[PDB]
Amino acid sequence: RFASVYAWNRKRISNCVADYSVLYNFAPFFAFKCYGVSPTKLNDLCFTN
Amino acid sequence: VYADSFVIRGNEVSQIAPGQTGNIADYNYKLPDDFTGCVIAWNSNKLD
């Protein structure tokens, strides 16, 4: 269950290895818009938080 | 002059554009940014 938009669910992600292979295997993806990055070049950068 | 032609779904016509990302512009028809052509797209019901 997802919370509604007035009280939106927030989560901080701790340190790990982040395979974005998953997250691609979900849906026909009506919107997939990165802004500061590009999805074709997502598996090489290493964000802090 | 290169005439390319196909059929796509109704809510997909916005994807036929230079510099886009979607399930039809990933690896079916990628339009480059050096695009000097013209995209014509019309409704094809009853024939198709």
DSSP states of B26-38: TTT-PPPSS--S-
Report CA-CA distances (Å) from B15 to B10, B22, B28, B39.
11, 7, 11, 11
- For residue B22, the Cα-to-chain-centroid distance in whole angstroms is 11
Whether A37 and A46 have beta carbons less than 8 Å apart is answered as no
Identify whether the C-beta of residue B16 lies closer than 8 Å to the C-beta of residue B29: yes
Choose among B42, B33, B38, B34: nearest CA to B4.
B38
From A7's Cα to the closest Cα of chain B, the distance in A is 30
Residues contacting B19, CB < 8 A, separation 6+: B31, B33
CA distance B24 to chain A (A): 10
Cβ–Cβ under 8 Å, residues A37 and A45: yes
Cβ neighbours of residue B4 under 8 Å, at least 6 residues apart?
B29
| A29 inside 8 A of chain B by CB | yes
Q: How far is CA A46 from the centre of its chain?
A: 13
The answer to whether residue A24 neighbours chain B at the CB level (below 8 Å) is no
User: Any residues with CB less than 8 A from the CB of B18 and at least 6 apart, and which?
Assistant: B31, B32, B33, B35
Q: Which value in Å is the resolution of this experimental model?
A: 3.2
A28 CB within 8 Å of a chain B CB:
yes
* Rg, C-alpha atoms of chain B: 11
Interface residues on B facing A, Cβ-Cβ cutoff 8 A: 21-23
